[PDB]
Design a protein around this ligand. Structure first.
Ligand code: SF4
Ligand code: F3S
Ligand SMILES: [Cl-]
Ligand SMILES: [Mg+2]
Lengths: 265, 595
């Protein structure tokens, strides 16, 4: 038997679902067909409406305390919760219902982990991360907008193999993927150390791959696997392609000033 | 009951609710009424999410905006970033260098192909394809079908189809059906033979593995996918033949483009032609909606940067089904694009008026009408006579329009007939497709040949699905050309990727307004910005699914989703197969629609 996954969607842009299917090792195809049973997911599921709703209670009963709840997006608390409506009811009610009998909860991406863009000031919907609503269940945060594909499938693979949540840091992120800051192993680090910086876009320094700190790179304060694991089967990452890290895996990164203002000190 | 746009709306029949609408991006509720013979006679589109990006942007730096609005949507990832940088560049009179233009075009066309192909296989296909029927297919006859549908596709052997079928069998036999659980399998609404179903499911799996390769083009130029990085003034991926872009990276991009062209030509377009032919033969020509009368696009992909007369998908507006007259569309004109909130969960000072997006307002107002069944937090039947959606109601000169690939292909065809040579390829694709659907494929499958015109075939759910596939193919062909132009320009000595003359806000006018438009995968996208003292004063988005999924306006006119469902019979009113098939043909993105 393959562990059921109920993948709920709150307020979101769907980047985390899209990132998941970019995974090369393992393939998303193999994850869905051979590793998990993806029993509810609005993005891919055949059933709609009443038939889709009926799946949740069936799985929750049959696999009580033995399914994984994955959450993409987050619940809004304003507009009586009806700025995110599922089956005529607030999303927060679905979230709490499915959470109650889950063996573990995965908060996918910055939305579920921290709030992401909808929670940026002034947060008109009072979008709230999952761990502030569900306070009595074990939650693993997998932040990033979106997270790296192999980080997402890496978390699933660990959980399925070992029937355990991996070791987490104080913020609830898996240490196996979020122990390093981008700046630790960023390939432009030798330029940083030598005081060699891009100062205007497409200047001579930019064409030589000089450090992007003075163009606002938030790599020095951002924990993720981007500089080593990299993106889309190790093809590139933001810095390699010439833009500074904007800090997208860190709590509240939208409200830490302009992306192009350098870090102080 | 009332009449509007040639549709006789009637809510006296049996009410059917579909919430959630699945296999879309984001959150939608749909309700219909059906008559005594299960024919839809009323349709209600409800966007069931809102985040408030327009509100969040106020006071921020215009140079940062692209990253915020990019997160409107991770499916159409980057198109909002493109609209945003275009809007800011327009406001500040910034012209980007040629290489930046070409790289942006290549990224845009990569998105088009990825979005279209993934939509068709992974979201749309299960409305046409019965997966359980695929289990009963004969591997040998499936191989023979594949060779008829697309002889150039190398994955066609009986053994190959047998192995795929066997994997599907054991998956189903496990009793854990996953995404196929509680499906509508065996419904009479499904018409494909077992062999066509197995071919399609096989391609579903092929596409799922291949799609991750295509987006590596975004990764090279933009660092990551989803959500590649953009830049006001150009692109960040500087060129040096230790740089972000060198010849090896460009060669890699070309290899990915060539793969894309093979997929579109050998797998995607032939499948849609074949499936379309078989549903045409079944008489399933429903879903035309507004495409039969009113279509709009801003126009896109100029052969010469900043020269709109050279748009390779030339736009404008058509009204009343008159394809001999394309009206020009100006996103700056306060009397053209306007948004109403009469039936939306927002508030204006005067809701009898539609606001141009430079004057747009986004103040939420979640309130339900008197005829609602249920409560504010437990809706049983939504009241479409009052406010019923988080989607605003965009109109053009007061008219309700359909947008999207179908709209663009109808516009391209009309332009081509008037003598526009930039639209020759789409015209060629359409005429080729009609001949395949009417004659070639029927002849190959031993079916009767038909004589539908493009005027008859295009305004339908089949036509809407076809146009998307053709557009994917055309975009692949275009970015192949763009790649050659990029490499030639670089080799000629121009390596520039960013104009930084007006990067610093000390150089800006103290106030400015701008608009950026994009032919996004789902239709006409625009971002309208006002800048004051270096900050965003107003930022309003009108997004393709805002047009298509819109609720009724002040005059009670219906939008494209609602019109498309009208007058469609359902095999079983409790199984939303036909509702899903037609809604999905618009590729609804609800996060986009509401932002
Ligand atoms: S580019 Fe960013 S992460 Fe890399 S060395 Fe410079 S500051 Fe650190
Ligand atoms: S912007 Fe995000 S994707 Fe990585 S390089 Fe920075 S954490
Ligand atoms: Cl955040
Ligand atoms: Mg808007």
């Amino acid at each position: 038997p393959r562990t059921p996954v109920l993948w709920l969607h709150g307020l979101e842009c769907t980047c985390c679902s899209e990132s998941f299917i970019r995974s090369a090792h393992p393939l998303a195809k193999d994850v869905v067909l051979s590793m998990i049973s993806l029993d509810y997911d609005d993005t891919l599921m055949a059933a709609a409406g009443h038939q889709a709703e009926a799946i949740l209670e069936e799985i929750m009963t049959k696999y009580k305390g033995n399914y994984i709840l994955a959450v993409e997006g987050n619940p809004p608390l304003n507009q009586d919760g009806m700025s995110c409506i599922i089956g005529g009811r607030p999303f927060i009610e679905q979230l709490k219902y499915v959470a109650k009998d889950a063996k573990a909860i995965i908060s996918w991406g910055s939305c579920a982990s921290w709030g992401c863009v909808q929670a940026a000031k002034p947060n008109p919907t009072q979008a709230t991360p999952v761990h502030k609503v569900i306070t009595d269940k074990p939650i693993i945060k997998v932040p990033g907008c979106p997270p790296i594909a192999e980080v997402m499938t890496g978390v699933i693979t660990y959980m399925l193999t070992f029937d355990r949540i991996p070791e987490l840091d104080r913020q609830g992120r898996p240490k196996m993927f979020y122990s390093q800051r981008i700046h630790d192993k960023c390939y432009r680090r030798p330029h940083f150390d030598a005081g060699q910086f891009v100062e205007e876009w497409d200047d001579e320094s930019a064409r030589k791959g000089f450090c992007l700190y003075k163009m606002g790179c938030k790599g020095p304060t951002t924990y993720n696997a981007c500089s080593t694991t990299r993106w889309n089967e190790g093809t590139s990452f933001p810095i390699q392609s010439g833009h500074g890290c904007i800090g997208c895996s860190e709590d509240g990164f939208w409200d830490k000033g302009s992306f192009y203002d350098r870090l102080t000190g | 009951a009332y009449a509007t746009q040639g549709f006789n709306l009637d809510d006296r029949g049996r009410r059917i609710v579909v919430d959630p609408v699945t296999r879309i991006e984001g959150h939608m509720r749909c309700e219909v009424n059906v008559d005594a013979n299960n024919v839809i006679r009323n349709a209600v589109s409800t966007g069931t999410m809102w985040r408030g990006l327009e509100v969040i942007l106020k006071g921020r730096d215009p140079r940062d905006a692209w990253a915020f609005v990019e997160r409107i949507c991770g499916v159409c990832t980057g198109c909002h970033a493109l609209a945003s940088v275009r809007a800011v560049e327009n406001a500040l009179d910034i012209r980007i260098p040629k290489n930046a233009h070409l790289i942006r075009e290549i990224m845009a066309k990569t998105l088009q192909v990825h979005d279209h192909a993934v939509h068709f296989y992974h979201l749309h296909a299960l409305d046409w394809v019965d997966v359980m029927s695929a289990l009963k297919a004969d591997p040998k006859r499936t191989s023979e079908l594949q060779q008829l549908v697309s002889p150039a596709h190398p994955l066609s052997s009986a053994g190959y189809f047998r192995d795929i079928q066997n994997r599907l069998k054991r998956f189903v036999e496990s009793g854990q059906l996953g995404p196929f659980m509680n499906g509508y399998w065996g419904s009479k609404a499904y018409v494909l033979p077992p062999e066509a179903n197995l071919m399609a499911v096989t391609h579903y799996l092929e596409a799922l593995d291949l799609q991750k390769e295509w987006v590596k083009i975004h990764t090279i130029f933009g660092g990551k996918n989803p959500h590649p990085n953009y830049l006001v003034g150009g692109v960040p991926c500087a060129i040096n033949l230790s740089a972000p872009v060198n010849m090896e990276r460009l060669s890699f991009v070309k290899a990915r483009i060539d793969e894309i062209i093979e997929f579109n030509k050998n797998v995607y377009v032939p499948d849609v032609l074949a499936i379309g032919t078989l549903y045409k033969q079944a008489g399933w020509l429903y879903g035309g909606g507004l495409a039969a009368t009113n279509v709009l696009d801003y126009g896109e992909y100029p052969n010469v940067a900043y020269n709109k007369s050279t748009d390779q998908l030339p736009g404008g507006a058509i009204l009343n089904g008159n394809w001999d007259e394309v009206f020009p569309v100006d996103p700056r004109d306060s009397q053209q694009v306007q948004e109403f909130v009469s039936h939306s969960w927002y508030k204006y000072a005067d809701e009898s008026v539609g606001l141009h997006p430079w004057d747009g307002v986004t103040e939420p107002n979640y309130v339900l009408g008197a005829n609602t069944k249920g409560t504010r937090t437990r809706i049983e039947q939504i009241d479409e006579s009052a406010k019923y959606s988080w989607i605003k109601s965009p109109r053009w000169r007061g008219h309700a329009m359909e947008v999207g690939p179908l709209s663009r292909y109808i516009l391209a065809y009309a332009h081509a007939r008037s003598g526009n040579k930039y639209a020759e390829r789409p015209k060629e694709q359409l005429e080729y497709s009609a001949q395949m659907i009417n004659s070639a494929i029927p002849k190959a499958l031993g079916l009767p040949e038909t004589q539908y015109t493009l005027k008859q075939l295009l305004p339908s759910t089949i036509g809407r699905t076809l146009a998307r596939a053709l557009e994917s193919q055309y975009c692949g062909e275009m970015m192949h050309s763009d790649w050659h132009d990029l490499v030639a320009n670089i080799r000629a000595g121009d390596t520039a990727t960013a104009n930084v003359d007006k990067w610093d806000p000390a150089t800006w006018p103290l106030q400015a307004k701008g608009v950026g438009t994009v032919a996004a995968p789902r239709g006409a996208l625009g971002h309208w910005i006002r800048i004051k003292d270096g900050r965003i004063e107003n930022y309003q988005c009108v997004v393709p699914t805002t047009w298509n999924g819109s609720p009724r306006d002040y005059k009670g006119q219906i939008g494209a989703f609602e019109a498309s469902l009208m007058n469609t019979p359902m095999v079983n009113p409790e199984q939303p197969v036909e509702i899903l098939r037609t809604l999905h043909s618009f590729d609804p993105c609800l996060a986009c629609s509401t932002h």
